[PDB]
Paper text:
Follicle stimulating hormone (FSH) is an essential glycoprotein hormone for human reproduction, which functions are mediated by a G protein-coupled receptor, FSHR. There are three members of glycoprotein hormone receptors, FSHR, LHCGR and TSHR, which are activated to mainly couple the Gs protein and lead to up-regulation of the secondary message cAMP in cells. FSH acts through FSHR, which is mainly expressed in gonads (ovaries in female and testes in male). Here we report cryo-EM structures of FSHR in both inactive and active states, with the active structure bound to FSH and an allosteric agonist compound 21 f.
To obtain a high-resolution structure of FSH-bound FSHR-Gs complex, a constitutively active mutation, S273I, was introduced to FSHR to enhance the assembly of the FSH-FSHR-Gs complex, in analogous to the constitutively active mutation S277I in the LHCGR19 and S281I in TSHR17. Human FSH was incubated with membranes from cells co-expressing FSHR and three subunits of Gs heterotrimer in the presence of Nb3526, which stabilizes the Gs heterotrimer conformation. Cpd-21f was also added to further stabilize the FSH-FSHR-Gs complex. The final structure was determined at a global resolution of 2.82 Å. At the extracellular side, FSHR_ECD shows an upward rotation by about 48° after FSH binding. At the extracellular ends, TM1, TM6 and TM7 have 2–3 Å inward movement, and TM5 has 1–2 Å inward movement at the middle of the TM helix. In contrast, there is a large movement at the TM6 intracellular end as much as 14.9 Å as measured at the Cα atom of residue S5646.27 (superscripts refer to Ballesteros-Weinstein numbering), which in agreement with the hallmark of class A GPCR activation. The point mutation S273I is located at the N-terminus of hinge helix, where the S273I mutation can enhance the hydrophobic interactions from ECD to TMD, and elevate the activation level of FSHR. The EM density map is sufficiently clear to dock Cpd-21f into the FSHR TMD pocket, which is created by the top half of TMD, including TM3, TM5, TM6, TM7, ECL2, and ECL3, as well as the N-terminus of P10 region. Interestingly, the binding site of Cpd-21f was found to be mainly composed of hydrophobic residues. Consistently, the binding of Cpd-21f to the FSHR TMD pocket induces inward movements of TM6 and TM7 at the extracellular side, which directly results in the outward movement of TM6 at the cytoplasmic side of FSHR, a hallmark of GPCR activation.
Residue numbers in the entry:
A (entry chain Y): 1 to 109
B (entry chain X): 5 to 92
C (entry chain N): 1 to 126
D (entry chain G): 6 to 62
E (entry chain R): 18 to 295, 329 to 645
F (entry chain B): 3 to 340
G (entry chain A): 11 to 60, 205 to 251, 262 to 303, 307 to 394
Write the structure that this text describes.
């Protein structure tokens, strides 16, 4: 299917000091096929899918602070691979549309 | 591949020759990306990845009965929309 | 009383023939085995021949094989011994001996001295 | 040598054994019957004694 | 299109701004869709969405500060067909009168919210099929009676999974047409009352994966077609097939359950005329293709050949006779020997232990046949409880303890015979009863240790129905089972060697006629052949498979054990005790005392 | 000389037989048809004594009806207290081969002997508190077959010499010797009046001897084979006998002829022991086929059988009081019945 | 009051029981043999180089053997023989032929073999006076046994080196005569062990030991029902 690893520029915000930074990394997005059905039958397997993650690794950087709070190590899991399949209801949050991957609460991109 | 858009194609089992009951199919955009912290503040069950989905479905249809009583829906209009059954 | 008495004997010419028999009394003849014992002059008792209750088993000594014949008559309660081709060495007193116990094959003490179930015997001379 | 002595002893033994007063069989059988009848009441084997009186039980 | 504080597009309004602390009553009444996202709304006041004719979809999402939804909020709009209340952690309460008659409704989702109880859906009365999506709500604990009555006149899709529900009330789904009932990931749930589906139609699909349900309801499942019970260890029992008339697919947890649908025994097939003659990659656009057969997973493993515990009737009848013969012959031998007034000797003491070990084998066979009769034609309902339960461990302990003790005692008897014959003149080495007792005490210790190691995890008995220690996975299990098998083979080798030496020691052709020598050889060959027939056929397959090279399946294995294993148990009392001059005299003496 | 003497002996024997037939009024069975039968007797084992290592060959009840002597071929002479089945004494013998044993009427001495040709007597009541040999008697040139105590000072003996003798214990010399038997004298029995004793020998003949005059008074020749056992009827006017011919015969001294003969076709074995109950109505005999048959002394019918042994019954006896019957067998066990 | 005498008697019983148990080991550790034969036999020399009953006690390889010789007894043996029904074996000694004393020896062997008792007792047969047998044969047997003429040497015979074939034929003819008596009558309950020996023969003790071990081994086989 038409989904592959791509660059994306996410950002994170510090609530204590009211400032944000930006970093790039890899992620997935694209298309996967679907079909609607003309005949109602509950036993029929419905055709709906999406392209999603497969594996995760983590990274760390120092993010400065304010006053007596200063540079601290922040971390989150970066993705490594992609897969087109049924969205995992356990780990993922399947949604119609969210807030978007890019934002900073203390400053608009 | 450049798979086709959400469109209206034919029906090669339930459409008697000359009596089409078209069906709605095609590709539409979907993606996944990390949950922003402002979003993670609102969720009880934490999730590390959002997924925005969209599914080719009928905008409007006419329900018709054929083949001795098998009621079916003719997709008069077709557009891709909320994914009801995409959950695993 | 239990008694055994022999008959026959006397002088016999060398190579001659003789017959000896023993008459029983006081016991059930059919249930006992019998034997013949002879005592030559200046010599101890010598077993001669034996016959079982039914008479189907018979034996003799090497010096007696083929010469002597032993038989019994359960009806008459008598013992038999047919003698022929006698020789000088056959001279002896022949005793009619009875096995100690009935219904048994062992005949231990027929040849012993001062036996209790043998007759006075008869003399044979050649 | 001793055969004649044994015969003499034998005949003597028979002579003194013959001159005895032999009682009639019927009288002796009656005597045995009387003895058994008289002492039948004192024979545990013939008549089982009471269990309490039995030394072995 | 524009609104005071809300963005819009083609009369579709998005209020993703913190300024929206209250629902704007100035929103155009002709709005096609309204999207309340992160509005900062604290309370959805009563009658907020009343009179919006063109409203076809409503979305509540990301409102963390949202606390309460009042009554009459959704009104009775004719166009509204989708509602999605999502990601509201602090939304603990929704008014029972929040939802009114929505004839058109098709989709409603209150997933991922702090609601304490299910929405009161008994006034929606939708004329279309409605899909219920109540997921990722961890605060709901119980479901009330007639919870979903009146949701719609048509059939309803029910998704109540990934929740904290722990109990189901009776008649919960009563008076509703059920298509899909998915209660997966509800770990706290433990039991379903039999009246769960009372007065209800369906469900066509039942999914109880990752849940502690013990048994399914005893009626109402005739319409159930697809069953999903993955990771349901408490579902050890299944309903009778006569109840699952229309079953079509079943994802069970244990392999043995998979062949309760063993065959094509579903006689009726649909075969509609449309199926007759009248990208992609889904059932070739066809419906009825070979649908009558029943699919299930996981498939039966080779260690679980799901026949009766006795796969064949002739085996079933034979075990009872074999078990009854072994038990009766051994007990009478034991009582005759023990009750005798003659003083005990080494051969008699060894015999008594051999009879006891043989009696244990008979008891094990009696237990297996009796359970086989109990579980006749229905083993797959009891296989999990039996194999994993204490009963199987007891059976495995019995067979292992009895077999090792029988082998040890038989070897001891042969060694005692060899010592007596070979060392007859050296009476200074006479074996007294105390020496035999010490050896027997060691033998009992060895047998008890061997039988107890499987219970303590070294090699479990649960792998097979008849509870033999076939656990080969871990190296320790391989070590333990192999040592037992190797020792059993070595015991036969010792027995043969001892008898071989006895023959060579007692043979004397200068004074003994040949016939006696052949007679002695024949008698000892009887004993050697009997043990070989008892051990070799079983040891062959047991040793080969323990080396991870299986040659025969468990189906034939059960036959081999039933036929060959009790050969020693039945033969030993006859060969070593019965028609023995001491035994013959003993039996007559004891019989006289019981005249 | 010999011919004339033999003819005279034959004439005397013919007279004796003629006199014997002249006194044959009727058989004991004929006169006893008026007496009711004993019926079934079902004696059962009450005690079993163990400890002997080899086959037993003799036992004798004491005057107290409690103490039992048992001589076995293993060389031990154990004394049993039948009431409590606990051994009182165990005398080790100088010769392992023992054929007979006896208990003195006073209960102070126990005698025994066998192939050694020496009769050994032990004093139980000893100042030292241990068994000892009071005296050993020698002079018999054959195995001591049987020995019985006349009193605390006199003991009578029989051996394979074809002769019997009376020993005075003090001087240890033969007071008188009894001769006239041709075969081995196997068993002996003292009369109740301690005045006469009857001997059975290995010549199918039984002799009645008088202790004081040292002469035989009667000879009985009703048997076919060697006589193994002999016992006196309680009144002293009759005695029973047993032989290998499988027949038990009861003789009367007054009549001087066989009053009764006990025999059954199924029995091909010889009799090992014989004894009479206190009343004399029961005749108990041991047989080679590991059992003892109880015979009606008057009706000549098998009252019962004692079949608790696994080997030959070598010795048998009953108490002076008649409370119990003790039997010894080659399996080294003593069984007490009733 | 009655417990004092019970205690004393119980103490006596235990004291006697301990002595009996100690003597039981000695009795069961000894093998008893009956040495039987005619006066002319070499039994007197056999005991010399190894009361009415004489005793000879010896050990081979640390096992006790007890041999009994009855000398002070009358000719009749049918009664006192009965006492020897539990001996391990009977050491029968036979001379060589003087008159036909061999027939008397054969008759005695037949009676011993056929008696109801001793029927389970094996016999060790010693053909003594072998040097005299060789002397006479080398220097007549057919006269006392006409069957000798038709007899031939056994095919399995193992004579000593340098032996006259006629001596071997006489040897085995006598042995076969005894073996025929042993085999033609009786059953497998007991066996005969023939051996050729003389006065100067130290192997006699070893032969008796080997025969006894074989007899006891066979007895154990019978107890175990293997034979
Ligand atoms: C009776 C011997 N015994 C056993 O535990 C024992 N009996 C058997 C068999 C009974 C019928 C055929 S084999 C087996 N075991 C243990 C080991 C083992 C591994 C197997 O493969 C993984 C295996 O599979 C076969 C290929 C079907 C079977 C057996 C005692 C120790 C109780 C004496
Ligand atoms: C998803 O995100 C959460 C945080 O929102 C991650 O939680 C971390 O888990 C690790 C252990 O695996 C802890 O050491 C960290 O402290 C957690 N994070 C925080 C902020 O406490 C989680 O690892 C992520 N991935 C998954 C699969 O849940
Ligand atoms: C010689 C005699 C005493 C042997 C014992 C009797 C046998 C024949 C008896 C004992 C137990 C019995 C079995 C017990 C139970 C059943 C289940 C039933 O659905 C079919 C018959 C079957 C399998 C029986 C067949 C007959 C049986 C095997
Ligand atoms: C000989 C001595 C040991 C007595 C034997 C008694 C027999 C009849 C006993 C022993 C153990 C018993 C079995 C033990 C276990 C159960 C499981 C249960 O669900 C049905 C009954 C059943 C199958 C029992 C039937 C009767 C049984 C076989
Ligand atoms: C020990 C021998 C000599 C005596 C026989 C006793 C037998 C019959 C007893 C002892 C242990 C018992 C088992 C112990 C445990 C269970 C589980 C229980 O829920 C059903 C019965 C069952 C399966 C028993 C079956 C019968 C059993 C095997
Ligand atoms: C010595 C023998 C012959 C006598 C009978 C004792 C038997 C019945 C005993 C001995 C050891 C016992 C087992 C020991 C341990 C357990 C584990 C427990 O979770 C269930 C019961 C079970 C499986 C026992 C059942 C009964 C058992 C098998
Ligand atoms: C004499 C007895 C009591 C000692 C015990 C020896 C046993 C346990 C030893 C001897 C040979 C060994 C085996 C040798 C080779 C293999 C094949 C391998 O693929 C798995 C392990 C396995 C199967 C070994 C396990 C342990 C083993 C079975
Ligand atoms: C009791 C007597 C027969 C001793 C021998 C029995 C057992 C221990 C023997 C016989 C067959 C043997 C196996 C035969 C073949 C191989 C293949 C190779 O990898 C060496 C070890 C291994 C796997 C052997 C391990 C030991 C083994 C299992
Ligand atoms: C584990 C062992 C002890 C089991 C019992 C022993 C069995 C196997 C027997 C059968 C054959 C016997 C061997 C037979 C022959 C001899 C020769 C001898 O000069 C020394 C003993 C020796 C070598 C024996 C030892 C024990 C033996 C091996
Ligand atoms: C009960 C059964 C075992 C009896 C069968 C007879 C057996 C034990 C006998 C008959 C002949 C014997 C063989 C003959 C001789 C020898 C010499 C010995 O130094 C090594 C063994 C060997 C090669 C024997 C092995 C065992 C053997 C085959
Ligand atoms: C257990 C038996 C009866 C089953 C059938 C097999 C039989 C025929 C076997 C078992 C043992 C065998 C014997 C074992 C030993 C020998 C000694 C040898 O020098 C000649 C063959 C002979 C005498 C064998 C003949 C055949 C035999 C008797
Ligand atoms: C009484 C007899 C038959 C049993 C004892 C012999 C044992 C050791 C024999 C019988 C069967 C044999 C196995 C059968 C087949 C194979 C497959 C081969 O690729 C490796 C060896 C292996 C695994 C053998 C090892 C040895 C084995 C286990
Ligand atoms: C093999 C299956 C049928 C189970 C076991 C069957 C039983 C009944 C069989 C197996 C082995 C058999 C024994 C084998 C050998 C003999 C020796 C013979 O002199 C008497 C019968 C006897 C003692 C048999 C009796 C019946 C028996 C015990
Ligand atoms: C199910 C059946 C076959 C087994 C249980 C019955 C057993 C106890 C029976 C079967 C055969 C029987 C034996 C058959 C023959 C005899 C010979 C006789 O002189 C003494 C009893 C004896 C030795 C019997 C004892 C009892 C016996 C062993
Ligand atoms: C008691 C002496 C030995 C004989 C024992 C025989 C036992 C026969 C009864 C067994 C009945 C088992 C039937 C199956 C049990 C069930 O209902 O599940
Ligand atoms: C039969 C008495 C002897 C002792 C038998 C019990 C042996 C138990 C050993 C269990 C060790 C298993 C290893 C473990 O799990 O720690
Ligand atoms: C495969 C079964 C037969 C086992 C053969 C074992 C071989 C060893 C026999 C030992 C007996 C002693 C042999 C001898 O030393 O003469
Ligand atoms: C430090 C770094 O790599 N920054 C880049 C940025 O220059 C680029 O414009 C963006 C594309 O989205 O990806 C990121
Ligand atoms: C827009 C469209 O597809 N309309 C079809 C029509 O052409 C057809 O006649 C009818 C019955 O099949 O179903 C509808
Ligand atoms: C992603 O960005 C890196 C620079 O950070 C660039 O080297 C790489 O080619 C880019 N790949 C894609 C697929 O955009
Ligand atoms: C269950 O549903 C039926 C209709 O199918 C209804 O009549 C009954 O009242 C319901 N039960 C309850 C308790 O309401």
């Amino acid at each position: 299917n038409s989904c592959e690893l791509t660059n994306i520029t996410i950002a994170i915000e510090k609530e204590e000091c009211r400032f944000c930074i930006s970093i790039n990394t890899t992620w997935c997005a694209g298309y996967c096929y679907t079909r609607d059905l003309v005949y109602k039958d509950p036993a029929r397997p419905k055709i709906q899918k999406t392209c999603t993650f497969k594996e995760l690794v983590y990274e760390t950087v120092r993010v400065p602070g304010c006053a007596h709070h200063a540079d601290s190590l922040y971390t989150y899991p970066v993705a490594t691979q992609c897969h087109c399949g049924k969205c995992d209801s356990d780990s993922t949050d399947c949604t119609v549309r969210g807030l978007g991957p890019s934002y900073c609460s203390f400053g608009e991109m | 591949q450049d798979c086709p858009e959400c469109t209206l194609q034919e029906n090669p089992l339930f459409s008697q020759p000359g009596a089409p009951i078209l069906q709605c199919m095609g590709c539409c955009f979907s993606r996944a990306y990390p949950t922003p912290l402002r979003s993670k503040k609102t969720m009880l069950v934490q999730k590390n990845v959002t997924s925005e989905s969209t599914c080719c479905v009928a905008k409007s249809y006419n329900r018709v009965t054929v083949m001795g009583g098998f009621k079916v829906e003719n997709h008069t209009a077709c557009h891709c929309s909320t994914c009801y059954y995409h959950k695993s | 009383q239990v008694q055994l008495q022999e008959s026959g004997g006397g002088l016999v010419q060398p190579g001659g023939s003789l017959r000896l028999s023993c008459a029983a009394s006081g016991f059930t003849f059919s249930n006992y085995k019998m034997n013949w014992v002879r005592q030559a002059p200046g010599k101890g008792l010598e077993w001669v021949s034996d016959i079982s209750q039914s008479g189907a088993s018979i034996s003799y000594t090497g010096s007696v094989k083929g010469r002597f014949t032993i038989s019994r008559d359960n009806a008459k309660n008598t013992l038999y011994l047919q003698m022929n081709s006698l020789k000088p060495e056959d001279t002896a007193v022949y005793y009619c001996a009875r096995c100690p116990a009935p219904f048994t094959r062992d005949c231990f003490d027929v040849t012993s001295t001062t036996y209790a179930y043998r007759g006075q015997g008869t003399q044979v001379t050649v | 040598t001793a055969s004649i002595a044994q015969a003499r002893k034998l005949v003597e033994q028979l002579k003194m054994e013959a001159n005895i007063d032999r009682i009639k069989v019927s009288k002796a059988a009656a005597d045995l019957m009387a003895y058994c009848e008289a002492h039948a009441k004192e024979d545990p084997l013939l008549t089982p004694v009471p269990a309490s009186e039995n030394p072995f039980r | 299109c524009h609104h005071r504080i809300c963005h819009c597009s083609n009369r579709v309004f998005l209020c993703q701004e913190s300024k929206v602390t209250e629902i704007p009553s100035d929103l155009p009444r002709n709005a096609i869709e309204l999207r309340f996202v992160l509005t900062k709304l604290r309370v959805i006041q009563k009658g907020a969405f009343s009179g919006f004719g063109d409203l076809e979809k409503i979305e509540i999402s990301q409102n963390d500060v949202l606390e309460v939804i009042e009554a009459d909020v959704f009104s009775n709009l004719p166009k509204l067909h989708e509602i999605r209340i999502e990601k509201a952690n602090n939304l603990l309460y929704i008014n029972p009168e929040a939802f009114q008659n929505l004839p058109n409704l098709q989709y409603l989702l209150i997933s991922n919210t702090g609601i304490k109880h299910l929405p009161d859906v008994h006034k929606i009365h939708s004329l279309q099929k409605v899909l219920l999506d109540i997921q990722d709500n961890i605060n709901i604990h119980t479901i009330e009676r007639n919870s979903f009555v009146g949701l719609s006149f048509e059939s309803v899709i029910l998704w109540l999974n990934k929740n904290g529900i722990q109990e189901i009330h009776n008649c919960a789904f009563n008076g509703t047409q059920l298509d899909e009932l998915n209660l997966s990931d509800n770990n706290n749930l433990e039991e379903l009352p039999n009246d769960v589906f009372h007065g209800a139609s369906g469900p066509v699909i039942l999914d109880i994966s990752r849940t502690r349900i013990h048994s399914l309801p005893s009626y109402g499942l005739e319409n159930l077609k697809k069953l999903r019970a993955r990771s349901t260890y408490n579902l050890k029992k299944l309903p009778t097939l006569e109840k699952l008339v229309a079953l079509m697919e079943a994802s069970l947890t244990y392999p043995i359950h998979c062949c309760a649908f063993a065959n094509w025994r579903r006689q009726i097939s649909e075969l509609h005329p449309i199926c007759n003659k009248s990208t992609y990659t889904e059932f070739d656009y066809d419906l009825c293709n070979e649908v009558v057969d029943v699919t299930c997973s996981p498939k039966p493993d080779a260690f679980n050949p799901c026949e009766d515990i006795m796969g064949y009737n002739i085996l079933r009848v034979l075990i009872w006779f074999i078990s009854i013969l072994a038990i009766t012959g051994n007990i009478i031998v034991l009582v005759i020997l023990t009750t005798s007034q003659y003083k005990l000797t080494v051969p008699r003491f060894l015999m008594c232990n051999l009879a006891f070990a043989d009696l244990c084998i008979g008891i094990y066979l009696l237990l297996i046949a009796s359970v086989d009769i109990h579980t006749k034609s229905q083993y797959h309902n009891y296989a999990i409880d039996w194999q994993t339960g204490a009963g199987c461990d007891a059976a495995g302990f019995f067979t292992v303890f009895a077999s090792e003790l029988s082998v040890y005692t038989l070897t001891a008897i042969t060694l005692e015979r060899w010592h007596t014959i070979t060392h007859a003149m050296q009476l200074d080495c006479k074996v007294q009863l105390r020496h035999a007792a010490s050896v027997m005490v060691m033998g009992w210790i060895f047998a008890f240790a061997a039988a107890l190691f499987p219970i303590f995890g070294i090699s479990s008995y649960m792998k097979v129905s008849i509870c033999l220690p076939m656990d080969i996975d871990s190296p320790l299990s391989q070590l333990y089972v192999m040592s037992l098998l190797v020792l059993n083979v070595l015991a036969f080798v010792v027995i043969c060697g001892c008898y071989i030496h006895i023959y060579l020691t007692v043979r004397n052709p200068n004074i003994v006629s040949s016939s006696s020598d052949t007679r002695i050889a024949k008698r000892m060959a009887m004993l050697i052949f009997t043990d070989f027939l008892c051990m070799a056929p079983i040891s062959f397959f047991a040793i080969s498979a323990s080396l991870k090279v299986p040659l025969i399946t468990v189906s034939k294995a059960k036959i081999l054990l039933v036929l060959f294993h009790p050969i020693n148990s039945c033969a030993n009392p006859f060969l070593y005790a019965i028609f023995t001059k001491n035994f013959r005299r003993d039996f007559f003496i004891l019989l006289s005392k019981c005249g | 000389e010999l011919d004339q003497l033999r003819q005279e002996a034959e004439q005397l024997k013919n007279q004796i037989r003629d006199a014997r037939k002249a006194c044959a009024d009727a058989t004991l069975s004929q006169i006893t048809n008026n007496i009711d039968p004993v019926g079934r007797i079902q004696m059962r084992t009450r005690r079993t004594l163990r400890g002997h290592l080899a086959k037993i060959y003799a036992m004798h009840w004491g005057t107290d009806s409690r103490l039992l002597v048992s001589a076995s071929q293993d060389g031990k002479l154990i004394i049993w207290d039948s009431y409590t089945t606990n051994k009182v004494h165990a005398i080790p013998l100088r010769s392992s081969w023992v054929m007979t044993c006896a208990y003195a009427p006073s209960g102070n001495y126990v005698a025994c002997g066998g192939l050694d040709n020496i009769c050994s007597i032990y004093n139980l009541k000893t100042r030292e508190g241990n068994v000892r040999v009071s005296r050993e008697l020698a002079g018999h040139t054959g195995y001591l077959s049987c020995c019985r105590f006349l009193d605390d000072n006199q003991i009578v003996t029989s051996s394979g010499d074809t002769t019997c003798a009376l020993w005075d214990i003090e001087t240890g010399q033969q007071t008188t010797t009894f001769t006239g038997h041709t075969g081995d004298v196997m068993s002996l029995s003292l009369a109740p009046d301690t005045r006469l004793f009857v001997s059975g020998a290995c010549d199918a003949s039984a002799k009645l001897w008088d202790v004081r005059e040292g002469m035989c008074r009667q000879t009985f020749t009703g048997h076919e084979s060697d006589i193994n056992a002999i016992c006196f009827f309680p009144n002293g006017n009759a005695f029973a006998t047993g032989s290998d011919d499988a027949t038990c015969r009861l003789f009367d001294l007054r009549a001087d002829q066989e009053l009764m003969t006990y025999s059954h076709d199924n029995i091909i074995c010889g009799i090992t022991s014989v004894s009479f109950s206190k009343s004399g109505r029961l005749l108990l005999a041991g047989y080679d086929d590991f059992n003892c048959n109880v015979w009606d002394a008057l009706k000549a019918d098998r009252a019962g059988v004692l079949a608790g042994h696994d080997n030959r019954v070598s010795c048998l006896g009953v108490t002076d009081d008649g409370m119990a019957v003790a039997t010894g067998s080659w399996d080294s066990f003593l069984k007490i019945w009733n | 009051d009655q417990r004092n005498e019970e205690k004393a008697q119980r103490e006596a019983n235990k004291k006697i029981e301990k002595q009996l148990q100690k003597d039981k080991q000695v009795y069961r550790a000894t093998h008893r043999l009956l040495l039987l034969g005619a006066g002319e036999s070499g039994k007197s020399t056999i005991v010399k180089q190894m009361t009415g009953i004489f005793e000879t006690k010896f050990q081979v390889d640390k096992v006790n053997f007890h041999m009994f010789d009855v000398g002070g007894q009358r000719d009749e043996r049918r009664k006192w023989i009965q006492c020897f029904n539990d001996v391990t074996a009977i050491i029968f000694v036979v001379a060589s032929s003087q008159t036909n004393r061999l027939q008397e020896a054969l008759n005695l062997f037949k009676s011993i073999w056929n008696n109801r008792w001793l029927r389970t007792i094996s016999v060790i047969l010693f053909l003594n006076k072998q040097d005299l047998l060789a002397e006479k044969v080398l220097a007549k047997i057919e006269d006392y046994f006409p069957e000798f003429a038709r007899y031939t040497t056994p095919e399995d015979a193992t004579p000593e080196p340098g032996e006259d074939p006629r001596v071997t034929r006489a040897k085995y003819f006598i042995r076969d005569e005894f073996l025929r008596i042993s085999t033609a009558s009786g059953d497998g309950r007991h066996y005969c062990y023939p051996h050729f020996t003389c006065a100067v023969d130290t192997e006699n003790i070893r032969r008796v030991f080997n025969d006894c071990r074989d007899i006891i081994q066979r007895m154990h086989l019978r107890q175990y029902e293997l034979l």
